[PDB]
Amino acid sequence: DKLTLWTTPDPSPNCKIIEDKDSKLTLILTKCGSQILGSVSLLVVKGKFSNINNTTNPNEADKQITVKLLFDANGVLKQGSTMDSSYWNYRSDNSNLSQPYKKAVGFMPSKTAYPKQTKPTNKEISQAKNKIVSNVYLGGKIDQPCVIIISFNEEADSDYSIVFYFKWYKTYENVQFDSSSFNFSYIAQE
Amino acid sequence: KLTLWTTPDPSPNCKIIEDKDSKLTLILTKCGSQILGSVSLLVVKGKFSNINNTTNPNEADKQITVKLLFDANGVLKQGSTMDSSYWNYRSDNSNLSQPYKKAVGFMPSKTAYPKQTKPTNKEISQAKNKIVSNVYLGGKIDQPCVIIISFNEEADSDYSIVFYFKWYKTYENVQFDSSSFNFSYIAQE
Amino acid sequence: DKLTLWTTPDPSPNCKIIEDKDSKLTLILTKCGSQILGSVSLLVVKGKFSNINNTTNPNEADKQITVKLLFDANGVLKQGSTMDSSYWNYRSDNSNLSQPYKKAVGFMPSKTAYPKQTKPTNKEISQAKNKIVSNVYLGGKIDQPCVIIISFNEEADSDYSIVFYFKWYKTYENVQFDSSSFNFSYIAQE
């Protein structure tokens, strides 16, 4: 079938913000022909970001988290991605031999919608179209906003990329990084 | 693919304060492992049909909760805010007057959105079963209202979808009429 | 195949805000049965909005953009739409400009979800449900917000319409109108 590429709904820790498996990234990608429908949430279970305190840790580095998914020409997740390979595969509809996927180019962000940028800016080429910008809410609390920026194909060192950038502006005291669910879509490569 | 909905223009089908005082337009479409949803709420009778927070300034006068409660078969339970008058599958090639096993495919996943026990465990998310954003009353940018959609957090039901609307501004003669809000969630199967 | 109607993912200039072909609208509409899944972004490549300066150009008309898509009873784009029809077509295995489509009623916003309003507004009839109201971010920068209002079927002289209204409040100084990607959905006519 191959219409869902995901972490499953409840992965074990599968993401390295600071240390291996310090966080759980839940990511579902569903193919609806020419668009991928996504939903992402991030829970930090260990380390400074599992109990944010920006009085104790007041630097810019203490107020953001970047999760990078890097893919090769076959749409396979590359080593060096923030998310590890423990939970990343097609949803199975039958229980016959389980193998890592070899091809998911149909799940990749379009290279023509979201080309790689060169650093001489030109007014003819968008700098925004490959970004989705909004807020998520830590603990699902309205008074704990966190900006999310999802960027497509902006990593120079991979064929495709999906990057989730989380940055908060408020000084949080003893707040676990735990983002409310964020729904999004993008144009598929094929 | 398959759609469970109120239709696009239900008659009043919701009880905020009194029977059929409001119209909830709710469309759920199954797309693989996800449900794609859109919701809007119009209050046609009662205090919330003409919000006036000078006359009604209490906290209870500045929020609306719409609860959809479902049983183990994905059937809408009577105590839901929305009544069963407009809640059925979109007419296909074939017709059918009841939902049951097919309804569980529209329910929010219990694995994605598990119930929480006593004092919460820091290894289990509190946030992932919530979508938090803004809608705009009358579709007017200067009339924001927070929306929080919560999945499966109602203790006495197998599944739930709850739409919480809460505003901070003091609205004067503003009908509760929310701009359309799009969302998605992980399906039970 | 007839599940995606789009601008192509990388359109040449296709929009007249002020002058012919001053802007590139990227718009993808994908049919998922009863709902259309959309994503929109707008880059202005010529004219004042290609380098917004609201100190130089301080008036209300200098702080908003309207893109109108007007459709006939067949779902075909009408003359007087902001966008050109040449590259507005179904996605197929043919990636080149081709014969215009004849019918796309299945992509049109529902007349029952989004009826035209009669002059006496009525508390029984929603004024909001045919609108999606949010923010997009110029250049993908959280400090450059822009309101977006998408309105369905509100243009009096057309069978269907999708209108994208962009309006900003900040005094931008030398900021290209370049909107971050905005994801939305609406109820299909059939």
Author numbering:
A (entry chain A), C (entry chain B): 178 to 367
B (entry chain C): 179 to 367
Paper text:
Species D (HAdV-D) are the most diverse species and cause both gastrointestinal tract infections and epidemic keratoconjunctivitis (EKC). Each protein forms key interactions to promote cell infection, with the terminal domain of the fiber, the fiber knob protein, interacting with the viruses’ primary cell entry receptor. The adenovirus fiber knob protein is known to have a highly conserved trimeric structure. Sialic acid (SA) usage has been proposed as a major mechanism of cell infection for EKC causing HAdV-D. Here, we provide apo state crystal structures for fiber knob proteins of 7 previously undetermined HAdV-D, and provide crystal structures of HAdV-D25, HAdV-D29 and HAdV-D53 knob proteins bound to SA.
We performed X-ray crystallography to generate structures of species D human adenovirus fiber knob proteins HAdV-D15, D24, D29, D30, D32 and D53 in their apo states. These structures show the expected trimeric form, all viewed down towards the apical domain of the fiber knob proteins ([Fig fig1]). HAdV-D15, D24 and D32 were crystallised in only their apo states, whereas HAdV-D25, D29, D30 and D53 crystals were also soaked with sialic acid. Adenovirus fiber knob proteins crystallised readily, under widely varying pH conditions. The achieved resolution is mostly very high, up to 1.37-1.6Å, although some species gave diffraction to a more modest resolution. Pseudotyped viruses comprising an HAdV-C5 core viral vector psedutoyped with the fiber knob proteins of several HAdV-D of interest (D26, D15, D24, D29 and D53) were generated expressing a luciferase transgene under the control of a ubiquitous CMV IE promoter for measuring transduction following cell treatment with and without neuraminidase treatment. Non-significant changes in transduction were observed when cells were transduced with viruses with the fiber-knob proteins of HAdV-D15, D24 and D29 ([Fig fig3]). There was an overall trend in reduction, although in BT-20 cells there was a small, non-significant, increase in transduction of HAdV-D29 fiber-knob protein virus following treatment with neuraminidase. These results indicate significant usage of sialic acid by HAdV-D53 fiber-knob proteins, and the potential partial usage across the other species D adenovirus fiber-knob proteins.
